[PDB]
Design an enzyme around this catalytic site. Sequence first.
Site, PDB file in Angstrom:
ATOM      1  N   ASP A 149       0.631  -1.424  -0.097  1.00  0.00           N
ATOM      2  CA  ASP A 149       0.106   0.109   0.104  1.00  0.00           C
ATOM      3  C   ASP A 149       0.947   1.242   0.044  1.00  0.00           C
ATOM      4  O   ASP A 149       2.107   1.154   0.659  1.00  0.00           O
ATOM      5  CB  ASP A 149      -0.949  -0.092   1.308  1.00  0.00           C
ATOM      6  CG  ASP A 149      -2.176  -0.790   0.936  1.00  0.00           C
ATOM      7  OD1 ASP A 149      -2.139  -1.559   0.105  1.00  0.00           O
ATOM      8  OD2 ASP A 149      -3.267  -0.773   2.104  1.00  0.00           O
ATOM      9  N   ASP A 173      -2.701   5.518   0.382  1.00  0.00           N
ATOM     10  CA  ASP A 173      -3.810   4.827   1.359  1.00  0.00           C
ATOM     11  C   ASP A 173      -3.625   5.529   2.775  1.00  0.00           C
ATOM     12  O   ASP A 173      -4.398   6.428   3.025  1.00  0.00           O
ATOM     13  CB  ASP A 173      -3.149   3.443   1.333  1.00  0.00           C
ATOM     14  CG  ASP A 173      -3.392   2.410  -0.021  1.00  0.00           C
ATOM     15  OD1 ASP A 173      -4.428   2.263  -0.143  1.00  0.00           O
ATOM     16  OD2 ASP A 173      -2.420   2.634  -0.911  1.00  0.00           O
ATOM     17  N   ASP A 177       0.700   3.368   9.598  1.00  0.00           N
ATOM     18  CA  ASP A 177       0.100   2.120   9.686  1.00  0.00           C
ATOM     19  C   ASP A 177       0.884   1.459  10.678  1.00  0.00           C
ATOM     20  O   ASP A 177       2.091   1.294  10.604  1.00  0.00           O
ATOM     21  CB  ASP A 177      -0.089   1.501   8.470  1.00  0.00           C
ATOM     22  CG  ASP A 177      -1.144   0.535   7.879  1.00  0.00           C
ATOM     23  OD1 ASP A 177      -2.237   0.639   7.325  1.00  0.00           O
ATOM     24  OD2 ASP A 177      -0.933  -0.695   8.202  1.00  0.00           O
ATOM     25  N   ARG A 229     -10.055   8.410  11.064  1.00  0.00           N
ATOM     26  CA  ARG A 229      -8.811   7.589  11.582  1.00  0.00           C
ATOM     27  C   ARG A 229      -7.687   8.107  12.231  1.00  0.00           C
ATOM     28  O   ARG A 229      -6.560   8.184  11.734  1.00  0.00           O
ATOM     29  CB  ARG A 229      -8.263   6.684  10.238  1.00  0.00           C
ATOM     30  CG  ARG A 229      -9.251   5.730   9.641  1.00  0.00           C
ATOM     31  CD  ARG A 229      -8.377   4.756   8.604  1.00  0.00           C
ATOM     32  NE  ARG A 229      -9.274   3.793   8.002  1.00  0.00           N
ATOM     33  CZ  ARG A 229      -8.870   2.843   7.290  1.00  0.00           C
ATOM     34  NH1 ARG A 229      -7.640   2.711   7.121  1.00  0.00           N
ATOM     35  NH2 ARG A 229      -9.793   2.049   6.735  1.00  0.00           N
TER      36      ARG A 229
END
Length: 346
Positions: A149, A173, A177, A229
Site C-alpha cells: 500500500d 492509502d 500504519d 482514522r
Amino acid sequence: DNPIDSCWRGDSNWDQNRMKLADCAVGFGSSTMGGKGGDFYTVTSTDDNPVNPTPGTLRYGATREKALWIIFSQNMNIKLKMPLYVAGHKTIDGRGADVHLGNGGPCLFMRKVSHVILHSLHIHGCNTSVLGDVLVSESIGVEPVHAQDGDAITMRNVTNAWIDHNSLSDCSDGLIDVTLGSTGITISNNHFFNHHKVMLLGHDDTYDDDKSMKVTVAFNQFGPNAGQRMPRARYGLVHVANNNYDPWNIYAIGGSSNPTILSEGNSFTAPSESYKKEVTKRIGCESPSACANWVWRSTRDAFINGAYFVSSGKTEETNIYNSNEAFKVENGNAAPQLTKNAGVVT
C-alpha cells in the site's frame, strides 16, 4: 511549546547538538534511542538503487546494521524506486533541510526492528509499489517484497519507535500504519493534512495479539482536510493527548475489537453537518450492551462547533505510564498552543 519540545529547544541549539532530541521522547515510545550514540550519516545524493544502494544515498544509510543518525546535505525531493526498509537503531533527521519523500514512489517501512526515530520529514504522494527485489537490510540482503500500500510510514512488528514533527499528507492509502505486534510507540508533533485515511493502529479484527499494543498520540495537528482514522484503533491501548483537530470528514477517533482509547486534553472542532458532529465512531459492535464494555474515555477535552465525544466505561485517572514515560497533559483549551509548531521544524 510542549513537554517534548521544551526538552531540546529550551537551552540547546539543535544544529550543534542534534542528538539531544533523542533524550526527549515521552509516552510509550520514550525508550526510543534512534541512532543515538551512532555516527552521523549524511545523505549527499537523491539516487536510489533498491538492490545495491551506494554510499551517500538514503537507502544505504537506512539499511546499515550499525547505529546511524541520518541527516541531509541539502534540500532534497527523493523519489524511491521500491519500499525503503529502515533498519533498527536509526534516526532520519530532516532538521536543517527541506526533505520530501513520496512524490509518486513508495515510502518508509519498518519490519521487525526497534529504536527508530523519524523526525522533521515531509512525506506526501506515496504510491502503491510494484512487486520486486529489495535490499531489506545490509544484514538481511536482497529479498522479494510483495506489492505494498501507498502508506507514508508502515510499521510491522516494531518496538520502541518515535514519529515526530513530520508533515504528512496526500498519500494513496494511509499516513501511518501500525500492525502485527508493534508497541512502545509515540506519534508526536506531526501535521497530518489533505488526506482521507490517516492512522491505523492494529490492522485486522483477526489479530488479537495486538492486545499488547501501546501507543501515544500527542501534540499532533490533525487537519485541515483530514478525513478520518485519527486514530482508528483495534485491540490495544492508545493514549490520545493534547492534539488539535480541524473539521474531519466522517469521524475523528474510532475503532473496533475493543480498543482502549484514552482521550485527554484534545481540542475538537466539528464540521457543520449534523451527522458529523460526533468525534467518536465504534465499528463492528456486537450489541450496545457489548460495545458498552469498551473503555473509551474523554478527560478535559475541549469541544467546538457542536462536537461531542461518546464515552464508555467508568471515569478514572490516567494511570498507564511509568516514570520514564509520564508527561503533563493540559486542558484541551491549551491544545492549539501546544501544537502551534506541529509539522517539520524550521
